[PDB]
Amino acid sequence: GALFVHRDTPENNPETPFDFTPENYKRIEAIVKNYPEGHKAAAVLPVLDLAQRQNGWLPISAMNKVAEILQVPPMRVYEVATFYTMYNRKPVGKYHIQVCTTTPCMLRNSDSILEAIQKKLGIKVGETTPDKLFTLIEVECLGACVNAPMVQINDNYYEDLTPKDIEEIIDELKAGKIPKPGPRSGRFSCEPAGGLTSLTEPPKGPGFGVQAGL
Amino acid sequence: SNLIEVFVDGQSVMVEPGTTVLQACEKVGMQIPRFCYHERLSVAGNCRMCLVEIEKAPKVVAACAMPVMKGWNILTNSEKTKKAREGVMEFLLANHPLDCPICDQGGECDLQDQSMMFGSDRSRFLEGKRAVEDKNIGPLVKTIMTRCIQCTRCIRFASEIAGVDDLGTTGRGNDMQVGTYIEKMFMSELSGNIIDICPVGALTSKPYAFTARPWETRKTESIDVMDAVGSNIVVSTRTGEVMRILPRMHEDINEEWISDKTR
Amino acid sequence: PKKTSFGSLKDEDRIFTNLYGRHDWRLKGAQSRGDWYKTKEILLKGPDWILGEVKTSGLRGRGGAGFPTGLKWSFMNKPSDGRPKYLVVNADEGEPGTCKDREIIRHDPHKLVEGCLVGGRAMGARAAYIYIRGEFYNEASNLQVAIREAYEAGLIGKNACGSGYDFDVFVVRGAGAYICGEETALIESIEGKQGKPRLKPPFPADVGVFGCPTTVANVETVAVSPTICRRGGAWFASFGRERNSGTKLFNISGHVNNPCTVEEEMSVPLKELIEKHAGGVTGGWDNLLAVIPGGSSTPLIPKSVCETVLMDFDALIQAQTGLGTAAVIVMDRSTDIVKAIARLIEFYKHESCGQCTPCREGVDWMNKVMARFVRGDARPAEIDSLWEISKQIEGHTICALGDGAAWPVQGLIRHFRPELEERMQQFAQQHQ
Amino acid sequence: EPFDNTTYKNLQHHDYSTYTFLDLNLDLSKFRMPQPSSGRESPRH
Ligand SMILES: Cc1cc2nc3c(=O)[nH]c(=O)nc-3n(C[C@H](O)[C@H](O)[C@H](O)COP(=O)(O)O)c2cc1C
Ligand code: SF4
Ligand code: SF4
Ligand code: SF4
Ligand code: FES
Numbered sequence: 001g002a003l004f005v006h007r008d009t010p011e012n013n014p015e016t017p018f019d020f021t022p023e024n025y026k027r028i029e030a031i032v033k034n035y036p037e038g039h040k041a042a043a044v045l046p047v048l049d050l051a052q053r054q055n056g057w058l059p060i061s062a063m064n065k066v067a068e069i070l071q072v073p074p075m076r077v078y079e080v081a082t083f084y085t086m087y088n089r090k091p092v093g094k095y096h097i098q099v100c101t102t103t104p105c106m107l108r109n110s111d112s113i114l115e116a117i118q119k120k121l122g123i124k125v126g127e128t129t130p131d132k133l134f135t136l137i138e139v140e141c142l143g144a145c146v147n148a149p150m151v152q153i154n155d156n157y158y159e160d161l162t163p164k165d166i167e168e169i170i171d172e173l174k175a176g177k178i179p180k181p182g183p184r185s186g187r188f189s190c191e192p193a194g195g196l197t198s199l200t201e202p203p204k205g206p207g208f209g210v211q212a213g214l
Numbered sequence: 215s216n217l218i219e220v221f222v223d224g225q226s227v228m229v230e231p232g233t234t235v236l237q238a239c240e241k242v243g244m245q246i247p248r249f250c251y252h253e254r255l256s257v258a259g260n261c262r263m264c265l266v267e268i269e270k271a272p273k274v275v276a277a278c279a280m281p282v283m284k285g286w287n288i289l290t291n292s293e294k295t296k297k298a299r300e301g302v303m304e305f306l307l308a309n310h311p312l313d314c315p316i317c318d319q320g321g322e323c324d325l326q327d328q329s330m331m332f333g334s335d336r337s338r339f340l341e342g343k344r345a346v347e348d349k350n351i352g353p354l355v356k357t358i359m360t361r362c363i364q365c366t367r368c369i370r371f372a373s374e375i376a377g378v379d380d381l382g383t384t385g386r387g388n389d390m391q392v393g394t395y396i397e398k399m400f401m402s403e404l405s406g407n408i409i410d411i412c413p414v415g416a417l418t419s420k421p422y423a424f425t426a427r428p429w430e431t432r433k434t435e436s437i438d439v440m441d442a443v444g445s446n447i448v449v450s451t452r453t454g455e456v457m458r459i460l461p462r463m464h465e466d467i468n469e470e471w472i473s474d475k476t477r
Numbered sequence: 478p479k480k481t482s483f484g485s486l487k488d489e490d491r492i493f494t495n496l497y498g499r500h501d502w503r504l505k506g507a508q509s510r511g512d513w514y515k516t517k518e519i520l521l522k523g524p525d526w527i528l529g530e531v532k533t534s535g536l537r538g539r540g541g542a543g544f545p546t547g548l549k550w551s552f553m554n555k556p557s558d559g560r561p562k563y564l565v566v567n568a569d570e571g572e573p574g575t576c577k578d579r580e581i582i583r584h585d586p587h588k589l590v591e592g593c594l595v596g597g598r599a600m601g602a603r604a605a606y607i608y609i610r611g612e613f614y615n616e617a618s619n620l621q622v623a624i625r626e627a628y629e630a631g632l633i634g635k636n637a638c639g640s641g642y643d644f645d646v647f648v649v650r651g652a653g654a655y656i657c658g659e660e661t662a663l664i665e666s667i668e669g670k671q672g673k674p675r676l677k678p679p680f681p682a683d684v685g686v687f688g689c690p691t692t693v694a695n696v697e698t699v700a701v702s703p704t705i706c707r708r709g710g711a712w713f714a715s716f717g718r719e720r721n722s723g724t725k726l727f728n729i730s731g732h733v734n735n736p737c738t739v740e741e742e743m744s745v746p747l748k749e750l751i752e753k754h755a756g757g758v759t760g761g762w763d764n765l766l767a768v769i770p771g772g773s774s775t776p777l778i779p780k781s782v783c784e785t786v787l788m789d790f791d792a793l794i795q796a797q798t799g800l801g802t803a804a805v806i807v808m809d810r811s812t813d814i815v816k817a818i819a820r821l822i823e824f825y826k827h828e829s830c831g832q833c834t835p836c837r838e839g840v841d842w843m844n845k846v847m848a849r850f851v852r853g854d855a856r857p858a859e860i861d862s863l864w865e866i867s868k869q870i871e872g873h874t875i876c877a878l879g880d881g882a883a884w885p886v887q888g889l890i891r892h893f894r895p896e897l898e899e900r901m902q903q904f905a906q907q908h909q
Numbered sequence: 910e911p912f913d914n915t916t917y918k919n920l921q922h923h924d925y926s927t928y929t930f931l932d933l934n935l936d937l938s939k940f941r942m943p944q945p946s947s948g949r950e951s952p953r954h
């Protein structure tokens with residue numbers, strides 16, 4: 001699935017109503033100034049991200065709006081939208097769950113994490129629940145390899161999951177709560193699970209080791 | 215002078231600084247393979263069919279893009295160079311469809327001709343083939359995009375020559391596609407010219423579809439009268455019947471383009 | 478006498494002293510651990526002195542290629558020609574098995590922001606763009622908070638650190654693509670185009686981001702830069718072997734008792750590193766089957782080699798692999814080696830940008846082949862076919878992603894051929 | 910002030926909203942130095 005050619009539909013067409021709220025416009029006014037004058041096209045990615053946050057996905061009307069305000073050919077914004085994968089060109093659930101499945105997360109049995117999430121929601125990969133609350137997709141390495149298995153929901157990393165651990169978060173989400181991020185195993189971060197083995201000593205103060213010449 | 219001396223198969227040739235390897239070989243009557251390099255467009259370097267070995271080097275460089283350095287012995291026909299073309303030509307034909315009999319380009323296709331001059335005689339590809347869906351871009355240029363080799367000649371021509379940033383690439387990976395992403399017609403006074411630059415049968419003349427084959431047409435070098443520019447053209451006939459119109463290169467008038475009305 | 482055994486890095490040497498986030502990471506916390514200390518006095522020594530410290534320390538890029546950092550940053554050291562000059566930091570941590578970079582921005586953000594100023598002044602740059610991958614939203618915000626703190630403390634901006642040198646820092650988030658970690662493809666995303674690598678020449682030191690000179694450096698190779706200047710390049714070189722000196726962050730993951738990110742010394746033995754910090758291989762060291770030293774772009778190695786191989790660039794190169802990002806991925810006997818590497822290929826196939834021919838049309842070919850090997854639905858005569866297909870991709874591509882996708886296949890065919898042929902026999906006789 | 914190595918000091922990211930990153934970038938505007946000019950409003954000019 002996930003075609004790369006747009007077709008007009010009643011709910012997704014260039015006449016769809018989209019426009020940045022004035023508060024967003026102020027934010028854009030500062031994004032464009034991170035780049036040299038005459039190279040205002042560098043704001044395509046952040047501005048497309050900002051639109052997605054406002055709407056949750058990018059209708060065809062949204063992309064054209066980004067093109068109009070940055071003076072960019074409309075096709076040059078369709079290239080960006082289809083290239084990067086965090087741009088949702090179709091509506092997504094309220095919570096986009098993203099189960100990593102690359103080898104490091106596969107070795108630590110992510111399949112059980114994926115299988116557990118399907119069973120709790122009764123949806124196959126790529127699908128959205130009938131209530132439009134959740135969307136589940138497999139993804140590649142998310143950078144939390146040592147904390148495998150793990151998933152991402154919207155903006156947060158939930159790490160060191162086990163079939164029971166993940167199902168709690170879904171229940172917490174389905175109640176309207178904001179589940180705490182970070183690993184659920186008994187550790188906090190990339191530190192060893194079985195007690196520290198390094199930096200178990202107060203950090204040296206300013207000026208330590210400074211050479212004489214300096 | 216500022217000319218630098220470089221060797222093509224050992225033969226000395228003097229070139230200006232900033233000349234590319236591919237241009238160095240032309241100076242001595244040697245023509246490197248190519249699909250993405252067009253002398254009248256940007257440099258893309260994304261087909262890798264022009265990879266060439268440089269003597270006393272461990273890597274093969276893209277002749278079209280690489281500027282030449284002083285005293286480079288270019289080995290246009292070494293074993294390493296030959297196996298670079300064979301490898302690349304193997305990847306282009308992996309997913310290409312078996313449309314030569316029903317393809318308008320058949321008989322004047324650069325993929326075909328360069329396959330038989332620089333590629334192997336058979337295939338070791340056992341998997342299934344990619345298939346893309348056609349895209350309508352107007353009543354002139356017919357699109358059968360399963361034959362596109364993602365060379366970007368059309369994208370670079372429309373942006374720079376015709377000045378219409380409406381063609382581009384969407385997706386990524388083996389699924390990357392060339393098109394407009396929406397129902398758009400590429401209607402410009404120079405629209406028909408993307409037919410010629412496309413080295414394969416992905417873009418072909420729609421009015422001319424299925425009417426003739428390249429080998430059975432007689433070429434007559436004549437002039438155009440649809441405007442005052444006097445574009446040089448080649449009129450193709452078959453059994454005393456005009457079949458198509460093609461540009462005839464002239465640097466000082468029309469380069470190698472013609473307008474839709476003429477074409 | 479130079480040492481012959483490496484490891485046991487004393488904490489007074491560990492540069493990243495807040496690696497695990499057990500102390501305050503803000504400016505006050507950073508300033509209590511030597512960060513942002515005598516930074517002005519470093520700057521006024523001049524760009525040559527700063528490079529001399531990096532050049533003498535034997536530093537090498539920590540992003541995966543491993544080129545000498547002193548030589549690279551010296552390309553920028555030429556008088557301007559009317560254009561800006563930029564330092565770009567590659568925080569697009571996307572290599573599978575690697576998480577070291579995520580632990581520097583999130584927990585030691587000020588150490589990086591100190592690096593930009595030290596590196597930027599060395600290169601004569603006027604500002605720093607930091608490319609932090611999209612999925613690291615929370616980490617990026619932490620980095621943004623640190624930048625504001627530095628801005629309000631006069632440590633950057635106009636008249637940075639009181640030295641008269643202006644330097645701005647900007648953080649730009651990628652929209653999600655592994656390829657955007659490539660130094661040139663990263664530049665394209667900053668410019669707003671698609672993340673497709675450029676050819677070379679020109680090199681970024683000639684025509685970089687926005688067409689101005691640019692140097693792309695990894696977070697790790699930039700975070701440690703101020704400390705090298707402070708503690709002297711001679712001190713840094715004392716660790717690791719010759720031409721491999723320093724300390725490296727390691728991510729040990731997969732089939733280990735206690736997966737962890739730990740800072741150790743270069744040239745540490747692989748067996749010592751796993752047993753000391755990671756708690757050994759799950760099920761005992763004899764349960765070890767294969768190890769991917771430098772993430773996933775590097776060929777795996779079998780157990781017999783893991784018992785004597787040191788963790789540095791040259792020793793691993795001598796083992797038909799590479800240090801890469803130093804992200805150790807461990808695999809045990811229970812691992813299905815073919816499927817495990819068949820998944821890495823399916824990773825590159827999706828992450829391939831698609832611009833150029835061999836990797837666009839060839840990495841999918843390898844992916845389709847490896848799928849049939851997993852089930853055994855092949856024949857032994859195709860193993861040499863896949864070997865040859867891989868060597869047509871390697872070296873014939875615009876970027877190194879094509880190289881990095883052929884190497885995983887070659888490693889599997891090199892060291893584990895019987896499993897492939899063993900698999901095909903079972904399928905042949907079952908379907909009969 | 911006492912050194913405690915058993916508590917997580919990275920607890921500010923548990924309550925980041927959906928506009929945190931953009932707002933921080935917005936707040937870091939008055940500090941920025943003026944950008945260089947290419948000389949033309951765009952490559953299309
Ligand atoms: C496909 C691909 C992905 C890469 N991803 C990263 C990355 O995530 N982080 C990084 O520092 N370098 C990455 N690199 C290497 C960069 O291109 C470049 O070599 C390095 O960032 C430059 O900094 P260095 O001097 O420390 O090596 C990648 C290269 C390739 C081909
Ligand atoms: S484009 Fe060329 S090779 Fe492909 S089907 Fe047409 S004639 Fe044959
Ligand atoms: S349609 Fe033709 S010209 Fe355009 S990219 Fe494909 S092969 Fe090249
Ligand atoms: S090797 Fe692959 S990822 Fe790299 S430039 Fe070529 S197509 Fe793109
Ligand atoms: S392999 Fe899953 S986060 Fe890296």
Ligand code: FES
Pocket residue numbers: 247248249250251258259260261262263264265276277278279
């Ligand atoms: S002709 Fe040189 S890579 Fe295409």
Ligand SMILES: [K+]
Pocket residue numbers: 319409410411412413414415416417418
């Ligand atoms: K054609």
